[PDB]
Design a binder for this molecule. Structure first.
Ligand code: CLA
Ligand code: CLA
Ligand code: CLA
Ligand code: CLA
Ligand code: CLA
Ligand code: CLA
Ligand code: CLA
Ligand code: CLA
Ligand SMILES: CCCCCCCCCCCCCCCC(=O)OC[C@H](COP(=O)(O)OC[C@@H](O)CO)OC(=O)CCCCCCCCCCCCCCC
Ligand SMILES: CCCCCCCCCCCCO[C@H]1O[C@H](CO)[C@@H](O[C@H]2O[C@H](CO)[C@@H](O)[C@H](O)[C@H]2O)[C@H](O)[C@H]1O
Ligand SMILES: CC1=C(C/C=C(\C)CCC[C@H](C)CCC[C@H](C)CCCC(C)C)C(=O)c2ccccc2C1=O
Lengths: 124, 40, 144, 165, 73, 742, 80
């Protein structure tokens, strides 16, 4: 069969993945979308603020960077939505279905924008 | 000796001798008649 | 000669495994199974890379595409002088048998075969492309 | 003169060009000894430079505003004003040699086609035959024309392979 | 100076014409592929047999001629 | 316990010119003679492919052994010519008197068709072509002081060349070693470690201690070369040597009584560069080769041959067996004693990597007198030995794939290191694929980021020292550690090994020989370009080796061979799947990567190291513009290629005008190659059909049928012309530049 | 699926069948040649277009011809 390897087949690694929102079955797709969106949204603000074109402005740097992070989350939400449209047109997990993914994309937008907003509040 | 003279008759050997001769003739002509541009 | 029936419980060669094996296609579209009898345990080369030991008696392998099965068949037949046969297996559980289609390898002429895609003319006697134009689809003069 | 050109012997720019080249050589000369090996070589170069500029002027070439010789290619203008040696005469000089080489090679290729194994006579040259054909090629223009008139120069259209059409 | 450049331009026109004209006159077939017409204007090749047939279609003659056109222009 | 012994066969082959008159005799296919022009190319392509002429390993080994004598004989003719031309057509004797003002020259051209202008004014009342091979510096270091000494070496070189050709004939036609002789790997290593490298190092130490050191000590003191004692007078008269080095007054007793400290005067550990000549101390170099001699002589007694003591290489390999690697190194010994290609793959890899290491160490630690201040020699030697190393490494990939196709046998390799590597090749190539994409974005993307920011008038947004910074902190730490090594970690060394680490510059004849090299943001960016282009070259070559036998596209690629064009247009198209084509593609990337390496070296040295020393300070050739300009692609185009190519394009009418011609000619050959790379033989075979028709019409059609080159030969012809044109273009550009200003 | 055609110049050498790496071709009885057999192409849906069969045909011009056509998972030679 496939080449067995500790990275591919280990107990500690398997348990960690099984607890991630993507692999945690039994949770509504919308809730998983919010949980995933919040994590990525919070991180997405970092690089924009520190290395953006308005990074050296004292107070505008925080606003401009976070506002650009919010924009990228919006674009990503569109990518999630159209992916579901193309992939699911006609199985065990509800997420991998036309109904499930549409809820998942909506949750990501809500969670992602909340994470970006929450990141801004931490700064000020 | 027949085979050796046959080897000298191979295409690469003939070309080397022929162009060595041809080049030498042209080089020698330009040594005694330097800078020919017009028949005159 | 009758169409053989595949035995899914046939033992497989001694192979550690590799990254050149089946992919998600096998679980969704199809895969191929090759089986043969081995006179003695011997080392052969896997078309997917590496070396495997064939058990004495029946052996069974699964491959991702037909060409891989027929590549192993050429090795076993030409070098080790065996006589393998392989199938096409679908995810629904159906099994299709081929090579040898009628039990005799195609290189050897056998009565009962019906000629297919045989044109009783030369290549130089085909019509010009203009005469097969607007036939509903791109058609070569050889097709008609 | 022709096309607005002037004889190099009467060209101001042509004369100035010679001084520039000699001046460059003289500048390098004064860093050596009188009769050292480098000095002798440089003096030899200067002699050839002076001879070259005298020969081109003596040849009656035409120089442009650049002060460099220009050649006349029209046969009518060349023969009219005595420039036949620039292009016109060398034209028939080259063709004789070019036809000589081509005619000799064609004779050899025909000669070995009759042999049992023509291919082995091409990688391994038949030197005695090649030398024989090399000397007889001096009269190629006469032999070439006679083949044309007798109709043995060209193959028949029916003996040449061609693709479907 | 204009003499040399003009003759280079002639080389470009004649060579580009050579490639394009060969691509058209040999489009219907050749000794290496007598029945090229049965494959169409644009196909990859006829395989490595018969010595190799890379860039044998009439489409490929045009493809090679574009390089010479850019060089000429 | 097969004894190690000499084993030969008497008169294996007859010496006759019969086969010289039968081209293709070596191969069954070509022995029948030509029918098409393809036969001619096949004759030269397969001439040295011994492994395919015969299946007998013994016959293959005997041809390899004698073909190596021919290579040695050719090098001796080449070496003899270099020494001879130094004696008869050089200004070496004048150079010894005034090394800092006279340009080395050892080639003179005849006065024909006006080419005598290439005999430039080089100094010493001599006219000739300036050489960048560094032979004058090498001869001075060894102690050569007259053209007679150069002349005698050339005559000795020809005698050695004759001996090498006799040996090749003797050991093939008269006494050919048997296969069992060639397979004494333990014996060969013992002799090559202690005998070739070991005694060779000791013998050269003898020359340096007795000839080079005394002669160069007086030359540096200013003694006229003609008034220096001859090397044999130094050898016969211990009194003379005692004056230069008092340690010689005690003879060899200190060596045998272990009072080795007595020899401290000529066996030194100074480090650094000799201030007078700008090169390494020869006393340091003598102690180096004495130490190296002992290390290798000890190394040559490790393997067991005939007397029990020693190691068995097979036993070492089979003992190194771990939990993660299955069987382990089992089966490698049989692979490496029965496959010449496997041996060649390893040796080319390390021999090429060694040549690249030589380039870095020789510039940073100039080992010859007056080598450093001769910027033309420094640039040429570094660039020459980088190119040699690059080609050898690509060959290592080529002959690793040949082994994989021809000499690989699965039965001998089951669950060993070699087998397990093949079984996760997708994991290796997929990961190496991602690393290359990552390195391409984060190294070349930075240049694109800087170019766009600069064009937009946003210099503060660029990656640079005056902007967002990328400091090679790790490299800077190592530079400082080596600079302080003599204080604590190498107490008995007086100076640091190189002046690149830090300290003060050494100037010879008003020019900088070596000074500290600073690493900044530009150096950070260029280094990660090197890592990118090297990793890609590994990907192409390693992919070819791992997929030589089969892949998910061609499951039976081994049966097709090592060198085939494709498997047809099926499966979407299979052009260039053979392992030979991975060498063909790998050559382009090796050329791409080494071109940046030699551009990096050339610009960094001129900008930051090379220059003229004056009262105020050091003024560099390009005035320190590397730091601010080399962070954009536009900077390289304008400041490096456009500005420095001024010398080559203005060379007409001078002694350097030859480089101008080759600069254009190289550009031509390179562009000419794209005809073969961008086209296919299908077009050309049809073109020849119309051309053949014209010859048939005139009864002048050849008997050997014209054929367009094969698919593979088109790719081989393309890459060879591409490399020659590209490399020759840089060669002309470098020499015309550095000779003119350096 | 590609198109594979056998023409009446076949001499029944069987080389095309041996060369094919996907068992697309086979030999059938015939009366039009000395060998009394002709090549057949009953399984063109498995053809990949390698044209190894054309490389192996001795007749001039070829007696087996492959016309690349519509692509699919099988004809594109994919294992994924
Ligand atoms: C189209 C190509 C071409 C042409 C037409 C010429 C023509 C000429 N070149 Mg040039 N040249 C070319 C390409 C060409 N070159 C190239 C590619 C290079 C680079 C390698 C050079 C490099 C070059 C140099 C370095 C020199 C020339 C010179 C010459 C002259 C030689 C005259 C001679 O040898 O008479 C000799 C007389 C003969 C009759 C020769 C033929 C002998 C046979 C046996 C006669 C048989 C008769 C029946 C002539 C004007 C020379 C010169 O002075 O030019 C002004 C000169 O020094 N050429
Ligand atoms: C490649 C083509 C070509 C071209 C464009 C020219 C061009 C020219 N030629 Mg030349 N010529 C050529 C080839 C060419 N020639 C050839 C192959 C030969 C034979 C070897 C000649 C022989 C020749 C002679 C004998 C004369 C010219 C002359 C001329 C000039 C005016 C007449 C003419 O030819 O008109 C245009 C050209 C053509 C239509 C092509 C055929 C030209 C024929 C062969 C010559 C015509 C001469 C003309 C009747 C002279 C009348 C007196 C004139 C002062 C008006 C003109 C510069 C005349 C001249 O020197 O004028 C100053 C002149 O006397 N040519
Ligand atoms: C370093 C260069 C080198 C060396 C050492 C060899 C060595 C060899 N070549 Mg090779 N060869 C080379 C370069 C080289 N070749 C190149 C560049 C080409 C062109 C592509 C060829 C083309 C070639 C062919 C076509 C053949 C060889 C053959 C040989 C073998 C016999 C030669 C012999 O008897 O010489 C004897 C040498 C002398 C007596 C020296 C004096 C006479 C010479 C001509 C000066 C030998 C293994 C022959 C063979 O049998 O190969 C298996 C053979 O047929 N070579
Ligand atoms: C790597 C080997 C090598 C190379 C590339 C050269 C290259 C050269 N040599 Mg040198 N030479 C060499 C080895 C070499 N030599 C050796 C080993 C010897 C000792 C016998 C000599 C002895 C020698 C002499 C005596 C002369 C040269 C000369 C020459 C030049 C003209 C050669 C020529 O056209 O002859 C003519 C061509 C044919 C006969 C064919 C040329 C730069 C000549 C030179 O530089 O003159 C100024 C010259 O006089 N060489
Ligand atoms: C005059 C002496 C002599 C003679 C008559 C022979 C005769 C023979 N040898 Mg022997 N041989 C000799 C000397 C001789 N050898 C020497 C000196 C060596 C040591 C290198 C060898 C090594 C040797 C080997 C290893 C083999 C032979 C073989 C042969 C046979 C065929 C050789 C052939 O086709 O050569 C024709 C080849 C050439 C003329 C090429 C010459 C190559 C040399 C090395 C010059 C290289 C120049 C180099 C490329 C220069 C750069 C080029 C660049 C400027 C373009 C034949 C029985 C072969 C055999 O028996 O096969 C069954 C065989 O495998 N010989
Ligand atoms: C391989 C390298 C090498 C060689 C060949 C030499 C050689 C020499 N060294 Mg040097 N040396 C070396 C490395 C070397 N050294 C190193 C690495 C060091 C650093 C430790 C030194 C340090 C050193 C010192 C300090 C001294 C020498 C000295 C000498 C000389 C005399 C040695 C002596 O007393 O020998 C004693 C005896 C022998 C070596 C045996 C000789 C055997 C002969 C050749 C046998 C001949 C037999 C034959 C059949 C007879 C001819 C018959 C025929 C005519 C018919 C000698 C020229 C001494 C000298 O004079 O310096 C100027 C000296 O003082 N060396
Ligand atoms: C120690 C070095 C070494 C040795 C001994 C060999 C030996 C061999 N190699 Mg390997 N190889 C090496 C290094 C080496 N290689 C390197 C560094 C590379 C990377 C470029 C390769 C890449 C390589 C490939 C890709 C192949 C081989 C092959 C072979 C085999 C046949 C070679 C042959 O017939 O050549 C005959 C020689 C020629 C046709 C002459 C080539 C001339 C070149 C292209 C000229 C380039 C320009 C020139 C140097 C300078 C300008 C010239 C001027 C006239 C303009 C043979 C076992 C072939 C094989 O089948 O192996 C099993 C094969 O396919 N090698
Ligand atoms: C300048 C010419 C050029 C370029 C840019 C590339 C680029 C590449 N080659 Mg190629 N290659 C070239 C010439 C070139 N090659 C030539 C002439 C040959 C023939 C010898 C090859 C042969 C060859 C081989 C055989 C291989 C490559 C590989 C690669 C890849 C290296 C790793 C990577 O992904 O880097 C990152 C990509 C880049 C640096 C490209 C430029 C990226 C820009 C600067 C930033 C991105 C733009 C941004 C998103 C904005 C877009 C806006 C727009 C959408 C509106 C990459 C795609 C290797 C590969 O695939 O490795 C995985 C590989 O195996 N090349
Ligand atoms: C580093 C990894 C060392 C790994 C190391 O030392 O492993 C050690 C381990 C050796 O295990 P064994 O003790 O069983 O080996 C016995 C040996 O004698 C060999 O038979 O090797 C492997 O498991 C092989 C596969 C490693 C796979 C490594 C994957 C990651 C590669 C990363 C490459 C980075 C390159 C950076 C260059 C500067
Ligand atoms: C492997 C071993 C190879 C060894 C090769 C040895 C070659 C030696 C050649 C030189 C011969 O000379 C070597 O011995 C001479 C005789 O003792 C020494 O001669 C020295 O001592 C003599 C003692 O009477 C004096 O007369 C000499 O004037 C004095 O120079 C040389 O200083 C030494 O260099
Ligand atoms: C130009 C070209 C050709 C045509 C090139 C050919 C046929 C090579 C020509 C070599 C020489 C010029 C011909 C043979 C010369 C003889 C040795 C005779 C010479 C006699 C004297 C003049 C020396 C291909 O065959 C080809 C094949 C595959 C991909 C690209 C190309 C490609 O680009």
């Amino acid at each position: 069969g496939m080449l067995e390897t500790p990275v591919t087949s280990a107990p500690i690694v398997a348990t960690y993945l099984s607890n991630l929102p993507a692999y945690r079955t039994g949770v509504a797709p919308v809730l998983r979308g919010v949980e995933i969106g919040l994590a990525h949204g919070f991180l997405l603000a970092g690089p924009f603020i520190k290395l953006g074109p308005l990074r050296n402005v004292p107070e505008t740097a925080e606003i401009a960077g976070s506002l650009s992070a919010a924009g990228l989350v919006l674009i990503l939400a569109l990518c999630l939505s159209i992916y579901g449209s193309a992939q699911f047109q006609s199985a065990r997990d509800p997420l991998f279905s036309a109904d499930g993914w549409s809820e998942f994309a909506a949750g990501f937008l809500v969670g992602g924008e909340a994470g970006v907003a929450w990141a801004y509040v931490c700064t000020q | 000796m027949k085979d050796f003279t046959t080897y000298l008759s191979t295409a690469p050997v003939i070309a080397t001798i022929w162009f060595t001769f041809t080049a030498g003739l042209l080089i020698e002509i330009n040594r005694y008649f330097p800078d020919p541009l017009v028949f005159s | 000669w009758t169409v053989p029936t595949l035995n899914p419980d046939t033992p497989s060669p001694i192979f550690g495994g590799s990254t050149g094996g089946l992919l998600r296609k096998a679980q969704t579209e199809e895969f191929y199974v090759i089986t043969w009898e081995a006179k003695k345990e011997q080392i052969f080369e896997m078309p997917t890379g590496g070396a495997a030991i064939m058990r004495q008696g029946p052996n069974l392998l699964k491959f991702g595409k037909k060409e891989q099965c027929l590549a192993l068949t050429t090795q076993l037949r030409n070098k080790f002088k065996l006589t393998p046969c392989f199938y096409r297996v679908f995810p629904d559980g159906k099994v299709q048998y081929l090579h040898p289609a009628d039990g005799v390898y195609p290189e050897k002429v056998n009565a009962g075969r019906v000629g297919a895609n045989q044109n009783m003319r030369r290549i130089g006697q085909n019509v010009n492309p203009i005469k097969v134009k607007f036939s509903g689809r791109m058609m070569s003069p050889a097709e008609i | 003169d022709i096309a607005g050109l002037t004889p190099c012997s009467e060209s101001k720019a042509y004369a100035k060009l010679e001084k520039k080249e000699l001046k460059t050589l003289e500048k390098r000369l004064k860093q050596y000894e009188a009769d050292s090996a480098p000095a002798v070589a440089l003096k030899a170069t200067m002699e050839r430079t002076k001879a070259r500029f005298a020969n081109y002027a003596k040849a009656g070439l035409l120089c442009g505003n650049d002060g460099l010789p220009h050649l006349i290619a029209d046969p009518g203008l060349a023969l009219k004003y005595g420039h036949a040696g620039e292009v016109f005469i060398p034209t028939f000089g080259f063709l004789y040699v070019a036809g000589y080489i081509g005619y000799v090679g064609r004779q050899y290729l025909i000669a070995v086609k009759g042999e049992a194994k023509p291919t082995d006579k091409e990688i391994i040259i038949d030197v005695p035959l090649a030398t024989k054909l090399a000397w007889q090629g001096a009269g190629w223009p006469l032999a070439a024309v006679q083949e044309l008139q007798r109709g043995t120069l060209l193959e028949k259209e029916e003996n040449i392979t061609v693709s479907p059409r | 100076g204009d003499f040399l450049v003009h003759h280079a331009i002639a080389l470009g026109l004649h060579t580009t014409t050579l490639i394009l004209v060969k691509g058209a006159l040999d489009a219907r077939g050749s000794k290496l592929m007598p029945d090229k017409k049965d494959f169409g204007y644009s196909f990859p090749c006829d395989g490595p047999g018969r010595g190799g047939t890379c860039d044998i279609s009439a489409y490929d003659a045009f493809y090679l001629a574009v390089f010479w056109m850019l060089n000429t222009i | 316990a097969k004894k190690v012994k000499i084993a030969v066969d008497r008169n294996p082959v007859e010496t006759s010119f019969e086969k010289w008159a039968k081209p293709g005799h070596f191969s069954r296919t070509l022995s029948k003679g030509p029918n098409t022009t393809t036969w001619i190319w096949n004759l030269h392509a397969d001439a040295h492919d011994f492994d395919s002429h015969t299946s007998d390993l013994e016959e293959i080994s005997r041809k390899v052994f004698s073909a190596h004598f021919g290579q040695l004989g050719i090098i001796f003719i080449w070496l003899s010519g270099m020494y001879f031309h130094g004696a008869r057509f050089s200004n070496y004797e004048a150079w010894l008197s005034d090394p800092t003002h006279i340009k080395p020259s050892a080639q003179v051209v005849w006065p024909i068709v006006g080419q005598e202008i290439l005999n430039g004014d080089v100094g010493g009342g001599f006219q000739g072509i300036q050489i960048t091979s560094g032979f004058f510096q090498l001869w001075r270091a060894s102690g050569i002081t007259s053209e007679l000494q150069l002349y005698t070496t050339a005559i000795g070189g020809l005698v050695m060349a004759a001996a090498m050709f006799f040996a090749g004939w003797f050991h093939y036609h008269k006494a050919a070693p048997k296969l069992e002789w060639f397979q004494n790997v333990e014996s060969m290593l013992n002799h090559h470690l202690g005998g070739l490298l070991g005694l060779g190092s000791l013998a050269w130490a003898g020359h340096q201690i007795h000839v080079s050191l005394p002669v160069n000590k007086l030359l540096d003191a200013g003694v006229d070369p003609k008034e220096i004692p001859l090397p044999h007078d130094l050898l016969l008269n211990r009194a003379i040597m005692a004056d230069l080095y008092p340690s010689f007054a005690k003879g060899i007793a200190p060596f045998f009584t272990l009072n080795w400290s007595e020899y401290s005067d000529f066996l030194t550990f100074k480090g650094g560069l000799n201030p007078v000549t700008g090169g390494l101390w020869l006393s340091d170099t003598a102690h180096h080769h004495v130490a190296i001699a002992v290390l290798f002589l000890v190394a040559g007694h490790m393997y067991r041959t005939n007397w029990g003591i020693g190691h068995s290489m097979k036993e070492i390999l089979e003992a190194h067996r771990g939990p993660f690697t299955g069987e382990g190194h089992v089966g490698l010994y049989e692979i490496l004693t029965t496959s010449w290609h496997a041996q060649l793959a390893i040796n080319l890899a390390l021999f090429g990597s060694l040549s690249i290491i030589v380039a870095h160490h020789m510039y940073a630690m100039p080992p010859y007198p007056y080598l450093a201040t001769d910027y033309g020699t420094q640039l040429s030697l570094f660039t020459h030995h980088t190119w040699i190393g690059g080609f050898c490494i690509v060959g290592a990939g080529a002959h690793a794939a040949i082994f994989m196709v021809r000499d690989y046998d699965p039965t001998n390799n089951y669950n060993n290191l070699l087998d397990r590597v093949i079984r996760h090749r997708d994991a290796i190539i997929s990961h190496l694929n991602w690393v290359c994409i990552f390195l391409g974005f984060h190294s070349f993307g930075l240049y694109i980021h800087n170019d766009t920011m600069s064009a937009l008038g946003r210099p503060q947004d660029m990656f640079s020292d005056t902007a967002i910074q990328l400091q090679p902190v790790f490299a800077q730490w190592i530079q400082n550690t080596h600079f302080l090594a003599p204080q604590l970690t190498a107490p008995n060394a007086l100076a640091a090994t190189s002046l690149t680490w830090g300290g003060d510059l050494v100037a010879v004849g008003g020019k900088v020989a070596m000074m500290p090299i600073s690493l900044g943001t530009s150096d950070f960016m260029v280094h990660h370009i090197h890592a990118f282009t090297i990793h890609v070259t590994v990907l192409i070559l390693l992919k070819g080796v791992l997929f030589a036998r089969s892949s998910r596209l061609i499951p039976d690629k081994a049966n097709l061979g090592f060198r085939f064009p494709c498997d047809g247009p099926g499966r979407g198209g299979t052009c260039q799947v053979s392992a030979w084509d991975h060498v063909f593609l790998g050559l382009f990337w090796m050329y791409n990567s080494l071109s940046i390496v030699i551009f990096h070296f050339s610009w960094k040295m001129q900008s930051d190291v090379w220059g003229t020393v004056t009262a105020s300070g050091v003024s560099h050739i390009t005035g320190g513009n590397f730091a601010q300009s080399a962070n954009t692609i536009n900077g390289w185009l304008r400041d490096f290629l456009w500005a420095q190519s001024s010398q080559v394009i203005q060379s007409y009418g001078s002694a350097l005008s030859a480089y101008g011609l080759i600069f254009l000619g190289a550009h031509f050959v390179w562009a000419f190659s794209l005809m073969f790379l961008f086209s296919g033989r299908g077009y050309w075979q049809e073109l020849i059909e119309s051309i053949v028709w014209a010859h048939n019409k005139l009864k002048v059609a050849p008997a050997i049928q014209p054929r367009a080159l094969s698919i593979t030969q088109g790719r081989a012809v393309g890459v060879a012309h591409y490399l020659l044109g590209g490399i020759a273009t840089t060669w002309s550009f470098f020499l015309a530049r550095i000779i003119s200003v350096g | 699926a590609h198109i594979v055609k056998i023409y009446d110049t076949c001499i029944g050498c069987t080389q095309c069948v041996r060369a094919c790496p996907l068992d697309v071709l086979e030999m059938v009885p015939w009366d039009g040649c000395k060998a009394s057999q002709m090549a057949s192409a009953p399984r063109t849906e498995d053809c990949v277009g390698c044209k190894r069969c054309e490389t192996a045909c001795p007749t001039d011009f070829l007696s087996v011809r492959v016309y690349l056509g519509s692509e699919s998972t099988r004809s594109m030679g994919l294992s994924y």
